[PDB]
Each structure stands twice: as structure tokens, then as C-alpha cells.
RNA sequence: GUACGUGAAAUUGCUGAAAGGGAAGCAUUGGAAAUCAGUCUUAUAGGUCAGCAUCAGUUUUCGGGGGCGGAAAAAGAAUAAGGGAAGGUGGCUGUUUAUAGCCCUUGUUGUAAUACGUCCACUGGGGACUGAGGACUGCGGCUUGCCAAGGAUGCUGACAUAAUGGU
RNA sequence: UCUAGUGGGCCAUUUUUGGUAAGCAGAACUGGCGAUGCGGGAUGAACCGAACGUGAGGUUAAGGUGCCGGAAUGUACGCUCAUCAGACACCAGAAAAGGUGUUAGUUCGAACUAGCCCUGAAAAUGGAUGGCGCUUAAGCGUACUACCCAUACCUCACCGUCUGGGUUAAGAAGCUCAGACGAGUAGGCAGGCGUGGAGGUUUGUGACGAAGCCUUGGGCGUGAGCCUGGGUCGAACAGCCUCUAGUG
RNA sequence: GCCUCGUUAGUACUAUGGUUGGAGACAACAUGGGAAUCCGGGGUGCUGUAGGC
């Protein structure tokens, strides 16, 4: 019972596939103080862009 | 049979260097780490708080979170047939900047510079590194360097 | 099939050694590739220069100057055996250095079971004076009045009609 | 009606002029090396010929019992079959890549006849991921025309002199499916060439091998 | 032998519909010619979507077509909308705008509401004559992942997917592994 | 013909054919014997098997001419010099070209030749297998027609047979 | 995304643990066998070479060329004489020390050092370099050409799969051009073959012989299978599209 | 004592290869990587900010 002979061959059969890399990650895993700040900054940035678009 | 403790078989990995024991250098705390920075994990045995697992010693990853006294590092760990993202909260005592990323950044600065003067002069600039080319043809002068003839030496008994 | 090769080479120039010395060897090998390989083999063991950090500066094939003159060649070799502690000196009568070396290789393989890897040739020199020859068989060939019967006569067409004469 | 043929005739003449220039370049370089060797010999110095930049790699071992690292490397060299040949640039990255697969390939310096006879007799192109024989110059027109490679002789010059477009030209050339060598290999094929075998680097003797396998 | 990674790598495509609908076969014939004999990437897309199955061709609604065609920034208001599939009705919209829609099928309510509101309903072959190259067309799709199966696909620990339960209720997979009071929450 | 519709295989007897030296059966290839059909017979064209020619594709095996390279092969020859000793020739065991010669060095013939390496989009033969495709398109060469140029045709004979092929 | 099978493994290289040892137990990396034929090792699951559609030609790998056995009773230089020599890796097993054996070497006649041979060496049916035999080998060491042949490689023909390019002038579910590839147990999937019954269809077959049966006859298909001539027989039976199942 | 340079040293060791040698132990070779002690030469802090003499 137990051996590791075939497992590496079985592993590379379908490659050692990397996880998909996305542009934005979740603001989870981040500091709660930082995360709530970024909400307020992003909320104001969205408002600022919309007002600038409306006035231009 | 094994014992599967967190610090098992870390006798030599977490050991302090010879004549490098004692107080930790203070410059470690004065370096700023930002998200996206490349850092090399090297566990310091003196600080037993915030230690990563013995797998992450010698691994390099990208910082994703910066905390009061710690850094969040993103490592990819081989689990069977895939890569898994491992997010290790490791204190800055066990973290150092990767000189490779610096060197890349300085090379990027140089490449942008060479591109600027190339466009200013109207010429094209070679920016891609090349592997070492085969040796070129060159002359070798024997003046005051007359070749000496060598013969293999006979066997001798010298213990 | 051997050919005598003069190989000259040196280590690549460096800051510590702007003018590296040139080392030259006369060594026998079937082709230039093996000749360079053995040349780096001898330098690698003596002068601390590797094929990675060295370079062959000259390759040349040496042809026998007087191949139509019978000569005697004395060869010193460092034979390697089951014990590996052996130095041999042998003499062969031939018309060319390449021929003498090839005869030496066959003789060592036949008598002492030595391969091309085991044998390394320390030096091949031409013995010009008869009194310098110390080998009895070579001196016997140096007998002024040499003469001997022809040995191993041996002379498809199976089923010959008459019994062979196999004589003079 | 006749405009196409008029332009094609002068296109053919231009190909002839470029091939004539290439032959002059080969002759001038060969003579230049000979004179430099002669003058160095006459003056007592040593002149080292330039280290080959082009290499021809031939796979000699079958597809059975091969370690994963060597198997991947020959996959990257496109030597997926026994008796398969490729032209390859020789630099630091390639030299160490061939060092790993030394027991399974034999490589050496190809001369002008080796390159020319290979591309004429066994010259096939990778056109639309298909192995199309180089039976006409229009095939190379459609594939490497934007690279200023207009004819078979232009392709030979790019391969032989290792021009700026070596990678595209070499990748366009489907790997050569050579035959078994007439006269046979040496007695023990799977030693090193220095040991009297046939693997590893064999310097200019890849030419004698290629002549046998064509 | 040859050292080849994969052998006879069949593509995951469909060369013809699994439907036996003779009229769908006729539409396939027309759009196979259009895709083959034109450089319209639109025609290639319509041919691909004709081959697709039912679950890969979800319904779209009158309101969703109205929403996608009446965006502020987009000026795709008068352009003909194209759906390879059905166009269901949305009764939640009390007033239907004027829309010119071409699709495989229209529900009776959707078709009546469009024609009453002043628009027009076309078939794919009719749009093959009005806009044979698909110029000035808004090719849209239904929300493919709106099926019930996608509520469950990918179920596992901490995936927040729907389980296969015979009855939604209090005594049906809510205790062990679903709340921290009962051992653990997963 | 009631031991009754049809009447299979196992197994059995007789007849005919062939084989069989301690298993048999089986596969490939052909001989022998037996057996048989297509095909043609006809409407310039066509049946079966052959022989040569000119080509094409693949390959094998002998030969010639030439260029280039190396110590611009090494040698050698003929012809001029110097020097040398012998395993000592003539002369008397001993000596230095004589009544034999050899070796070393240098010049001339010589820019010698040959061998080896290498290349020719230089060339002369011999043998074998293959003939896929089926109006025209193309890329070439020649001088509009021709051509060895995007896969065999041409000229003949024998038999028209159990010949080839099948079992 | 859904699901099958598997959840007894074994051998070799190198590293290694427990063990007096083991064709022993237990691991680590890679390659094989299981699932895999083929050429060579006389023979053998994993050794060496090479991986497999049907064929023609050519050329090779490992291994070989006295005969069995296709291919030199080849070339060059040596060693060996064995009263039961030697003969090719894995491998079918042997040692210290010796020799008035012999061939060489090294150092001061002597001591040695090395190869081959012999002694050490010692079993039970008759018997195994595979056999015959082989001795200036057909033994051993080394070099050198010529030659032999795998389903491997190369050119070609054909079959199938997959892949890409064409086709409104072509049962478009058709036609056409091109390239690459072909091992397979457990397992998966696709397209076909054959059996009983049902709806439709075929101006369908049939007592002037249906079905069934036998056949040293003929034809088709890669195959499952189908068609047909001759004989026997006596009342029913089939092709195509679909339905179904107590369907091989 | 410590830090560097050389000697040790292409030595020890090691990756890949052979129907290599050897009864084994182990060794040589082919293609690559390549130390350590001993020993010898040199060296006995440099530097940032703010100031004072």
C-alpha cells in the first residue's frame, strides 16, 4: 500500500493547469478599513465622471 | 513514521545563519511594500509570529494586501494537477524585495530611454536581449607567446 | 585509420589573463573531432582549462616526412589496467609514426587487453642509432644479413582437382 | 493579358540577379577565409575560423523509452520521428538545449550543398498547416513574400547565411523526413561520436551523413 | 512511429442541426450559401447559431429587445434586431415601442403586440433579403445561463449553489453543514 | 408406407479421391491434380499474356572529365652542392665512395605529380519496382507551334487459349 | 457539464531502508509490462532495437555472416593448447593464493607487475557456447571494409479517420482539391449487419414451386452478412420508409 | 581573529551515455557542472543627516 510512481505522469496528462487570471480581484481578503474606503472613493469617482460627462 | 507538525523537519531551514544570530537588522522595517510588488519569502527564526509554512520558504510571490505589520503574498502551489492560489499573511521580517523585479524595472527604464534617443535620431533601436552569439573570427599573435609543446605525464606514486 | 594531429589552443582571454599562453600537442586520433576531444582531455587534467572556457586556436594534420624510409619508433605510454599502475616503453619498426602508433594500439590490446581509453601515449620518438635500440627483436630485424623463409603460404573454387603443393 | 507575363518575366530576372549575388557572396566568403588562413600560416600566427552559427540537427533514436525532459526538448525542436532533420541557429540557449538531448540527436555544421540538396530534394513548406512540396516559387511567394524571400534560392540564402528572418524561414520549412543512411551507421549507433558512435556533435561530418540519407 | 501529443483531435463543433425540421434545413441551406459565398462574419454567426441546440438558443423578450435597442449612448434604435431563436412576449411592458425584429419564432402574444404597436416581424430568410450581409443589424442573444440547471452546476463546499432537494422546506437539507449551530456551515 | 410433412448437426456404413515414419488442425507463398467463371467473339476501335523503345517517379551499381583546398599535400624523379656516418662497398678485423651505395641539408626542373578532402545548376553506362490521375487551364524551356514542363505512351508479336485469374 | 472503468499491481536503471541471506519485505526519480505485437538475446510479460492500417520497392536499428541460417571458411596484428579449453551485456553464476605454463613488461642473475591458460574446483536419469563441430579458430583483444534484414525510416499505390480550402452550376444528406495520422485490455462513443411482430409502400415473389434444408458451383463486402446456380422440398414470403421487442 | 585574492583543483563529488572493463568491489572513458580544508599574498572599517573645533 502506497507509492508515487504513476501520480506525476497522471498529473501532467492534462497539464499542471494554472488558475485563470482576471483583471480585478475581489476586495475581499483586503483590509476592511481599506475596502470600505475604496467603496466611497469609487462611488465619488463614478459620480465625478458622470457629472463631467453630463456637463461636457 | 512521520509527525506532521507545522515546524517538522525545519531544523536547518529556520536556523539562523552562523554568526548571524541575535538582534534583527532594523532596515527590514523601513521598507515599504505596495500591492503588485514581487517579494521573496525567507523565514526568520527569531520572529515566531506571522511565520509562513515551511513550503513558502524560498518561494517568490506578488503582494496583494498590505497590513499594519504584515504583508499578503500570493503564491501558486502545486496541488495534484493544478495550481492553487495561496494567500499567506507573512510578517515583513520574513519578506524581502526581489532583485529580479528591480533589475527588470531598471531595464524597462533603459529601454524606454534608448527608444527616446532612437526616435530623436530617426533610427531603429535594438531592445530585445539576445543569447550569447557564436564566437567571431579573430587573429591570435604568437609574438613573445611561442606555443609550448605538452606531453602527458608518466605515472608516479605520490600519496 | 589514425592521423597525427597538431592541436594548439588556449583559454579564452580574461581580465586576469589578458595574454593567455598557447599550448600545443601532437596526438593521434581518427579525425579532427576526436583529436580536439583528446587535446582538451589532456589540458583539462594538467593546466586547468576546460573546453567551455578554452578554445582551439590551430588544427593541423602532420604527414610523415619520409614515409618511404624504414625506421624504428620508440613509444612511451601510460597503460591503465585493473590496477592502473603501469608505464610501458615499446619499440616498433615501421615507416610512419601513424603506422607505428596503430601497431602499438593493436599490440597493447592483444597482449595486455588494453583499449583506446586505457592507453595514453606519452611520447613517440625515432631511434636513429642501432646501438640505442634495446629490443632484441628490433635488433634482429636490424641484422645486416636478414633473410628468412616466407611463412604462412596458404597458396573461391571449392573442390580443387589436385592436392596443393603449398611449398616452393 | 500580357501585363502579368511582362511583370512576371522581370520578376524572374530579378530572382536570377539575386541568386547570382548570393553565389558571389558564397564564393567571396569562402575565398576570404582561405586567404586569411594562408596569410596567418605564412606569417606564423593563428587565425581561428568563425564559430558556426547554423547547425543541422538529426534525430537518431526512436520514440520509445525517453525521459520527459529530453522528450519535451525534441518536441520543441520538432524532431518527433527518427531520421528527422532541422536547421537551427547556434547560440547559448540552443547549445544548452542540444546538450540535454545529446544521446538522441546528432548535429553538425552543414555546408552549401547540404542545405541546397536538402531544400531541393526534400524541401517542403508549412502552408496553411500543411506539408506542401516546394515545387514552385509561387508557394514561397505566398508564405514568405512579405519577408523579402521570393524564391527557393532566397530561402537557401536565408538558411545558409542565417539572415534576420531565420526563425520564420526555418519554421516555414517542414522538418526534413530523411531516409535511412545508405551504407549504414557505425557499428554501435548509440554511443557518442567521439567514442566511435553516432550521437552528439560530429562537426562537419553531418555533411557526410546527410549525403548518405539523401 | 511518430511522437504526436494528441491523435485525431475532433473539434467540438456541430456541422448540421440535430433537428429534422425541413424548414430549418432549408434555412440552413440558404445561410450556408450566404456564409460560404460572402465575407459576412454576420452570416457565419447566423449559420453557427442555426446549428445550435435549444438550450444554446434561449428565448428573448420584447422588453429586452426594447431595452437593448433604446440605450442612450448607442444609436442602434432603427437598426433591425436579429435573434436566432424565439422572441417571447413581456406583458410587464404596457406600451410596446415600434420594433423591426427578425427571428426564427415569435410567440403569438409577441407577434400580435409588435404588429399592433406598428413594428414588423420578419423571418431569417426575409432578413436574408432586406440585409443579406447583415448591415445595420443588432444581433442579440438570450441569457443562456438563466436555466434551472445553472442554479446547481458547480455545487460544492462554499460555492453558494442550489442543491437537488425533493422539497424546499425546513426538514430538507438545512441542519448539518448548513448552519454553525449544527456542527459546521458549508 | 402408419418406425409416415419438411428431415438439420453430432454420430455411423458404403463408394470415389487423396494423405499418413511418435498427434492433428492453422496462416503465407507457389507446384501438382481437379474444377469454374469472366472476358472476347464484336461495334477505326476493342480480349489474355508477352518483348523492345522512348519517358516519368523512386532507388541501386560501376566509370569518366574538371575546379578548389593541405606544409598552395608529404614524398619522389632528373640535375647541381655542402655535410654525414654506417647494419662498412671497393680497397686491408679494420676504414668513409673508390671496382656498390645510403643518409642529412639546400637550389633548379616546379607553378611537378599522385593520394586524400571537397564541390560541379560536368558527364557515360548496367539493373529493378512503379504508370496513381484522365478534355483544356499552371510554372517553365524552345522557336506561332514544338518540348523529358501539373502522374505512360509508342511500336510489335503470340494466344485467342483454361492462357491469366478464381476455388 | 454528465458519466464509465480503476481504487490487488509488477519489472528495470540509479539512490536506499529492515534483513545472515533471498526470484525477500519497504520506499524515492524515470522508463517499461499490465494493455503490446514486431527484429535481436537459442528459448522468456517488462533486457537491446523499434512501437503496428493494406501492399510494392529501397535503406537501416539491435544483432549478426563455417553449417543448421539470409549474409566474407573476409582483411591486418597478436595472445591461447586446456586428460573433459573458450565462446558476447541483462544471464543463468565463483574466490584468496598459486604454476620450472607461456607471452610481455618494471626495477635492482633476481625480485616482481601484468594478460591468456591451468590448479584451487567438490553429485546424484543421458545432455547441452542453441546443435554440429571449431585450434596460423568457426576462441580471445583491437582496427578495417563488404554484406544480411524488422510491422522502424524513405518514395509510391489504396483503405479509413481527422483537419483545412472550394462548390447555385449538384441522392448540397451531393460533388471536388490537399495535408497529417493509424498499438490497445477495463471503459466510452459512433455508424452499420442479422432475428420475431406493427403502420405505410413496392402495377412486389409464389403450386410453371413460398419457406426451410444440403452443396467438392459462381459473385459482392474490411467485416457482421447478402446474392446466386444445382439438388431436396411443399404454401406461403420478401425489398424500402418507419414502429416495436422475450432480438444474435 | 576576521574579510578578500590565489594554491589546493579541473582534485573530491556529481547530471547524462555505452551489448564499456571487472566474479564483485569498484574503475576508466564520452558529453556537461564543479567544490572544501591546509597553504601563501593583500586588508584591519566604510558611509548618510544635522551640527561643533
CSV table of N, CA and C (backbone and C1' of nucleotides) in Angstrom, one decimal, chain D residues 8-9 12 23 31 34-35 38 41 111-113 116-117 121-122 136 153 182 211 214, chain F residues 58-61 67-72 117-121 138-141 143 150:
chain,number,residue,atom,x,y,z
D,8,UNK,N,5.9,39.3,-64.7
D,8,UNK,CA,6.5,38.1,-64.2
D,8,UNK,C,7.8,37.8,-64.8
D,9,UNK,N,8.1,38.2,-66.1
D,9,UNK,CA,9.4,37.9,-66.7
D,9,UNK,C,10.5,38.8,-66.0
D,12,UNK,N,11.2,37.3,-62.7
D,12,UNK,CA,12.1,36.1,-62.8
D,12,UNK,C,13.5,36.6,-63.0
D,23,UNK,N,25.4,33.6,-54.9
D,23,UNK,CA,26.5,32.8,-55.3
D,23,UNK,C,27.9,33.5,-55.2
D,31,UNK,N,36.6,32.2,-50.3
D,31,UNK,CA,38.0,32.7,-50.7
D,31,UNK,C,38.6,33.5,-49.6
D,34,UNK,N,40.0,31.4,-46.9
D,34,UNK,CA,41.2,30.7,-47.4
D,34,UNK,C,42.4,31.6,-47.4
D,35,UNK,N,42.2,32.9,-47.9
D,35,UNK,CA,43.3,33.8,-47.9
D,35,UNK,C,43.8,34.2,-46.5
D,38,UNK,N,45.8,31.4,-45.1
D,38,UNK,CA,47.1,31.3,-45.8
D,38,UNK,C,48.0,32.4,-45.2
D,41,UNK,N,49.2,31.5,-41.7
D,41,UNK,CA,50.2,30.5,-41.8
D,41,UNK,C,51.5,31.0,-42.3
D,111,UNK,N,27.1,22.4,-44.9
D,111,UNK,CA,27.7,23.2,-46.0
D,111,UNK,C,26.7,23.5,-47.0
D,112,UNK,N,27.1,24.3,-48.1
D,112,UNK,CA,26.2,24.8,-49.0
D,112,UNK,C,25.4,23.7,-49.8
D,113,UNK,N,26.1,22.7,-50.2
D,113,UNK,CA,25.5,21.5,-50.9
D,113,UNK,C,24.5,20.9,-50.0
D,116,UNK,N,21.4,23.1,-49.9
D,116,UNK,CA,20.8,23.2,-51.2
D,116,UNK,C,20.1,21.9,-51.6
D,117,UNK,N,20.8,20.8,-51.4
D,117,UNK,CA,20.3,19.5,-51.8
D,117,UNK,C,19.1,19.1,-50.9
D,121,UNK,N,15.7,18.5,-53.0
D,121,UNK,CA,15.2,17.2,-53.0
D,121,UNK,C,14.0,17.0,-52.0
D,122,UNK,N,14.3,17.4,-50.7
D,122,UNK,CA,13.3,17.2,-49.6
D,122,UNK,C,12.8,18.5,-49.1
D,136,UNK,N,7.4,25.1,-56.7
D,136,UNK,CA,7.3,26.3,-57.5
D,136,UNK,C,7.6,27.5,-56.5
D,153,UNK,N,16.0,29.9,-54.0
D,153,UNK,CA,17.4,30.3,-53.7
D,153,UNK,C,17.5,31.4,-52.7
D,182,UNK,N,22.3,5.2,-46.5
D,182,UNK,CA,22.9,4.2,-47.4
D,182,UNK,C,24.3,3.9,-46.9
D,211,UNK,N,24.5,13.4,-47.0
D,211,UNK,CA,24.7,12.8,-48.3
D,211,UNK,C,24.2,11.4,-48.3
D,214,UNK,N,20.2,11.2,-48.1
D,214,UNK,CA,19.5,11.7,-49.3
D,214,UNK,C,19.7,10.7,-50.4
F,58,U,P,12.0,11.4,-57.8
F,58,U,O5',12.2,9.9,-57.2
F,58,U,C5',11.4,9.6,-56.0
F,58,U,C4',11.6,8.2,-55.6
F,58,U,C3',13.0,7.7,-55.4
F,58,U,O3',13.6,8.1,-54.2
F,58,U,C1',11.8,6.1,-56.6
F,59,U,P,15.2,8.6,-54.3
F,59,U,O5',16.0,7.2,-54.4
F,59,U,C5',15.9,6.3,-53.3
F,59,U,C4',16.2,4.9,-53.8
F,59,U,C3',17.7,4.6,-54.1
F,59,U,O3',18.5,4.4,-53.0
F,59,U,C1',16.3,3.7,-55.8
F,60,U,P,20.1,4.7,-53.1
F,60,U,O5',20.6,3.4,-53.8
F,60,U,C5',20.4,2.1,-53.3
F,60,U,C4',20.8,1.0,-54.3
F,60,U,C3',22.2,1.0,-54.8
F,60,U,O3',23.1,0.4,-53.9
F,60,U,C1',20.7,0.8,-56.6
F,61,U,P,24.6,1.0,-53.8
F,61,U,O5',25.3,0.5,-55.2
F,61,U,C5',25.3,-0.9,-55.5
F,61,U,C4',25.8,-1.1,-56.9
F,61,U,C3',27.1,-0.4,-57.2
F,61,U,O3',28.2,-1.0,-56.7
F,61,U,C1',25.6,-0.2,-59.0
F,67,G,P,41.2,21.6,-63.7
F,67,G,O5',40.4,22.4,-62.6
F,67,G,C5',39.7,23.5,-63.0
F,67,G,C4',38.8,24.0,-61.8
F,67,G,C3',39.5,24.3,-60.5
F,67,G,O3',40.2,25.5,-60.5
F,67,G,C1',37.5,23.1,-60.1
F,68,C,P,41.6,25.6,-59.7
F,68,C,O5',41.2,25.5,-58.2
F,68,C,C5',40.4,26.6,-57.6
F,68,C,C4',39.9,26.2,-56.3
F,68,C,C3',40.9,25.8,-55.2
F,68,C,O3',41.5,26.9,-54.7
F,68,C,C1',39.2,24.2,-55.2
F,69,G,P,43.1,26.8,-54.1
F,69,G,O5',42.9,26.0,-52.8
F,69,G,C5',42.1,26.5,-51.7
F,69,G,C4',42.0,25.4,-50.6
F,69,G,C3',43.2,24.8,-50.0
F,69,G,O3',43.8,25.7,-49.1
F,69,G,C1',41.7,23.1,-50.5
F,70,G,P,45.4,25.8,-48.9
F,70,G,O5',45.7,24.4,-48.1
F,70,G,C5',45.0,24.1,-46.9
F,70,G,C4',45.6,22.8,-46.2
F,70,G,C3',47.1,22.8,-46.0
F,70,G,O3',47.4,22.2,-44.8
F,70,G,C1',46.5,20.9,-47.3
F,71,A,P,47.8,23.0,-43.5
F,71,A,O5',49.2,23.7,-43.9
F,71,A,C5',50.4,22.9,-43.7
F,71,A,C4',51.6,23.5,-44.5
F,71,A,C3',51.4,23.2,-46.0
F,71,A,O3',52.0,24.3,-46.8
F,71,A,C1',53.4,22.2,-45.2
F,72,A,P,51.1,25.4,-47.5
F,72,A,O5',50.9,24.8,-49.0
F,72,A,C5',49.7,24.1,-49.3
F,72,A,C4',49.4,24.2,-50.8
F,72,A,C3',50.6,24.1,-51.7
F,72,A,O3',50.1,23.6,-53.0
F,72,A,C1',49.5,26.2,-52.0
F,117,G,P,38.7,10.7,-48.9
F,117,G,O5',38.5,12.3,-48.6
F,117,G,C5',38.5,12.8,-47.3
F,117,G,C4',38.5,14.3,-47.3
F,117,G,C3',37.3,15.0,-48.0
F,117,G,O3',36.1,14.9,-47.3
F,117,G,C1',39.3,16.1,-48.5
F,118,U,P,34.7,14.7,-48.1
F,118,U,O5',34.5,16.0,-48.9
F,118,U,C5',34.3,17.2,-48.3
F,118,U,C4',34.5,18.4,-49.3
F,118,U,C3',33.5,18.4,-50.5
F,118,U,O3',32.2,18.8,-50.2
F,118,U,C1',35.7,18.8,-51.2
F,119,C,P,31.0,18.1,-50.7
F,119,C,O5',30.6,18.8,-52.1
F,119,C,C5',30.2,20.2,-52.1
F,119,C,C4',30.7,20.9,-53.3
F,119,C,C3',30.0,20.4,-54.7
F,119,C,O3',28.7,20.9,-54.9
F,119,C,C1',32.4,20.7,-54.9
F,120,C,P,27.7,20.0,-55.8
F,120,C,O5',28.3,20.4,-57.3
F,120,C,C5',28.2,21.7,-57.8
F,120,C,C4',28.7,21.7,-59.2
F,120,C,C3',28.1,20.7,-60.2
F,120,C,O3',26.8,21.0,-60.7
F,120,C,C1',30.5,20.9,-60.5
F,121,A,P,25.8,19.9,-61.0
F,121,A,O5',24.4,20.6,-61.2
F,121,A,C5',23.7,20.6,-62.4
F,121,A,C4',23.4,21.9,-62.9
F,121,A,C3',24.5,22.9,-63.2
F,121,A,O3',25.1,22.7,-64.5
F,121,A,C1',22.9,24.0,-61.9
F,138,G,P,-2.8,28.7,-68.5
F,138,G,O5',-1.9,28.4,-67.2
F,138,G,C5',-2.3,28.9,-66.0
F,138,G,C4',-1.5,28.3,-64.9
F,138,G,C3',0.0,28.5,-64.9
F,138,G,O3',0.4,29.8,-64.4
F,138,G,C1',-0.4,26.2,-64.5
F,139,C,P,1.5,30.7,-65.3
F,139,C,O5',2.9,30.1,-64.7
F,139,C,C5',3.1,30.0,-63.3
F,139,C,C4',4.3,29.1,-63.1
F,139,C,C3',5.5,29.4,-63.9
F,139,C,O3',6.2,30.5,-63.5
F,139,C,C1',5.1,27.0,-63.9
F,140,G,P,7.1,31.4,-64.5
F,140,G,O5',8.3,30.4,-65.0
F,140,G,C5',8.4,30.0,-66.3
F,140,G,C4',9.2,28.8,-66.4
F,140,G,C3',10.0,28.6,-67.7
F,140,G,O3',11.2,29.4,-67.7
F,140,G,C1',8.9,26.6,-67.3
F,141,G,P,11.6,30.3,-69.0
F,141,G,O5',12.2,29.2,-70.1
F,141,G,C5',13.3,28.4,-69.7
F,141,G,C4',13.4,27.2,-70.6
F,141,G,C3',13.6,27.5,-72.1
F,141,G,O3',14.9,27.9,-72.5
F,141,G,C1',12.0,25.8,-71.8
F,143,U,P,15.8,28.7,-79.4
F,143,U,O5',14.7,28.9,-80.4
F,143,U,C5',14.5,28.0,-81.5
F,143,U,C4',13.2,28.1,-82.2
F,143,U,C3',12.9,29.5,-82.8
F,143,U,O3',13.5,29.7,-84.1
F,143,U,C1',11.0,28.8,-81.6
F,150,G,P,5.2,19.6,-64.5
F,150,G,O5',4.5,18.8,-65.6
F,150,G,C5',3.1,18.8,-65.7
F,150,G,C4',2.4,18.7,-64.4
F,150,G,C3',1.1,17.9,-64.4
F,150,G,O3',1.3,16.5,-64.3
F,150,G,C1',0.9,19.9,-63.1
